[PDB]
């Protein structure tokens, strides 16, 4: 088996990407945020509070025939920003892209947070992180990828996110048309259950390359590039007028400035994130201050390669016994 699904950004500064997913019988197609930095398949449903659904498409589990309660079974997740969701759990059929997966645990939200309700292009989340992270109780479930993994051609899934355009999520195979050159795979540490790897340095614009090791996760779930303070600051001193602001809570630069490119290490390889991707547009509407896409990891305790650096490469998530992360240039 295999399956390619089109992910299309929800915004004009690409700050999230939704991929359509079919749940039930017959099919209910909800648009889901594919998060490799969580491990929960949750959705906006019919059991979700009515003051808590704005304009989202809902998954009505009493009109899927493959749909059954997992009783006493209960979920509760919290994200890196505040972000909250929770309820009960169903078992049902999920296709992504044609790849069918049967009795997958679909967690059906009874409470969602304010910031999920504000968010009307996203109907729920699909976790593509490691399964020790799954939050269901008292019996822990697995992710799509882990429920499909055995039935797939190669146990792997690619991220190919576009800059201002849609992209693709492929399950089961490497599309060798989708990239330039070689893919460099590097070693992954699965111990905290993240797509966690080790970056071999950085370059800022045309400058010289720094051999330091940056431990990060691959998280398609995060918009921006969260790197340690020394690295991020070496960055922003190349852009004239950029400061750190304690009421925007991060690095801004005026909009008329030319953003130079960020280079990160993949083994002996180099993936250049062009100047253009790091500009997240003006802070408020009207403003001539613009939000930067390289921000400090200091206040979250972990470094994230988010959508800014991932949407610069073709990404292979090798879900083999000894998992690796592969980046190519595109």
């Amino acid at each position: 088996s295999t399956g390619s699904a089109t992910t299309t950004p929800i915004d004009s500064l690409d700050d999230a990407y939704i991929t359509p997913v079919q749940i039930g019988t017959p099919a209910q197609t909800l648009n889901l945020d594919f998060d490799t930095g969580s491990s929960d398949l949750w959705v906006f449903s019919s059991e979700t509070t009515a003051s808590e659904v704005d304009g989202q498409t809902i998954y009505t589990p009493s009109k899927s025939t493959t749909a059954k309660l997992l009783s006493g079974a209960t979920w509760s997740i919290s994200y890196g920003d505040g972000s909250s969701s929770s309820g009960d759990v169903y078992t049902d059929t999920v296709s992504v892209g044609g790849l069918t997966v049967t009795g997958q645990a679909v967690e059906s939200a009874k409470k969602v947070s304010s910031s999920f309700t504000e968010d009307s292009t996203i109907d729920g989340l699909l976790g593509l992180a490691f399964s020790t992270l799954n939050t269901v109780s008292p019996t822990q479930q697995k992710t799509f990828f882990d429920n499909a993994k055995a039935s797939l051609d190669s146990p792997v899934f690619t991220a190919d996110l576009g800059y201002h355009a849609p992209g693709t999520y492929n399950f089961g195979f490497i599309d060798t048309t989708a990239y330039t050159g070689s893919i460099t795979y590097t070693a992954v540490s699965t111990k905290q259950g993240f797509w966690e790897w080790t970056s071999t340095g950085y370059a800022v614009g045309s400058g010289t390359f720094k051999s330091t090791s940056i431990d990060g996760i691959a998280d398609t779930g995060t918009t921006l590039l969260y790197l340690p303070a020394t690295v991020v600051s070496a960055y922003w001193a190349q852009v004239s007028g950029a400061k750190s602001s304690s009421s925007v809570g991060g690095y801004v630069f005026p909009c008329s400035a030319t953003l130079p490119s960020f280079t990160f290490g993949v083994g002996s390889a180099r993936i250049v994130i062009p100047g253009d991707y790091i500009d997240f547009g003006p802070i408020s509407t009207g403003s001539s201050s613009c939000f930067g896409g390289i921000q400090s990891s200091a206040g979250i305790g972990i470094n994230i390669f988010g959508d800014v650096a991932l949407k610069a490469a073709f990404v292979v998530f090798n879900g083999a016994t000894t998992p690796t992360l592969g980046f190519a240039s595109k």
Binding site: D33, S78, G80, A129, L133, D219, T223, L224, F291
Partner: peptide
């Protein structure tokens, strides 16, 4: 902008 920080 409305960035995303997808677990805790």
């Amino acid at each position: 902008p409305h960035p995303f920080h997808x677990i805790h």
